[model samples]
Target: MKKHIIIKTIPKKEEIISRDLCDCIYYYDNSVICKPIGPSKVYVSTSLENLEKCLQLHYFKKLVKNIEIFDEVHNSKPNCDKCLIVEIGGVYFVRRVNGVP
Candidate 1:
């Protein structure tokens, strides 16, 4: 399956957001997890159009959830320095120091 994926240059920040994505997909090591500024409440859906309805109808309440990935001892991940993890439903965003950019 991996072989079928065509290679292309990475997209710019603008190019990435310009494209309409169908769904959220996580691809990275689950070996490191860190803290976020807040366990922010958010409504999310793979269908951006459906999610946008939250503002139109003006009836969406917020909620927060935590992962055992932040557990004090049993959930520790290696070398999480200068980084953090935010997991919402099945989507995971690794927030790291942007020394590359």
Candidate 2:
């Protein structure tokens, strides 16, 4: 028997809103762990329409979930990141950084 999991997809409008940059991204308490940021500590952006343009997905995969995008000031707490808490099978659940351009 084949297990059929319903993967999600992002619309065109959603893609525009999803394209963004971040200093780092972290994965929550999951069995499969990963460090979405590089040692350089530079900001990384996401691009669905064109992989060549935005190249963060190489680290982030289908199994990746409950992610936090640290795209704001390094210090000072209180919602300084973007939450892609939802399961993103097709690179749609990720969104722009709140209050950051």
Candidate 3:
């Protein structure tokens, strides 16, 4: 059981959907997308505090079953800061946050 946090720039005009467990953020027509490394679960938070809260609340287990927790990065850099699409999935959940193309 591991956890990860992904950071990406949300595009404009797109919609992001999340549940009580997992979270997602994306732009409508941008080109930025991100996900945690390995087959681990991901979580979203408005701030670092919320992320910690989510992790402590044991919400990751309800979101993704199989996951690998990696080293924490303080203010990790984004893969592509440009515009792009972002999505998330876990079991029977899927959401499209943005579509740059």
Top candidate (lDDT) = 3
Instruction: Name the better of 1 and 2 by TM-score.
Output: 1
Per-residue lDDT of candidate 3, residues 2-92 (tens digit): 2234532223211221233334222221222233322233334234444444444443333433322222332433344333323344222
- Estimated TM-score for each candidate: 0.24, 0.17, 0.25
Which residue pairs overlap in candidate 1's backbone? none
Error of 1 at 84 (Å): 2.7
Q: Model 1, which residues run further than 4 Å from truth?
A: 1-50, 61-78, 85-93
Candidate 2 per-residue lDDT, tens place, 1-101, comes to: 11111111232322222323222222211121121222222222332223222234644332222223422222223342454322323222233445656
Tens-digit lDDT string for candidate 1 (1-101): 11011112122322232122112121121221222222232222222333233223322222112212221121234355665654443444444555744
Question: lDDT of model 2 at residue 48?
Answer: 23
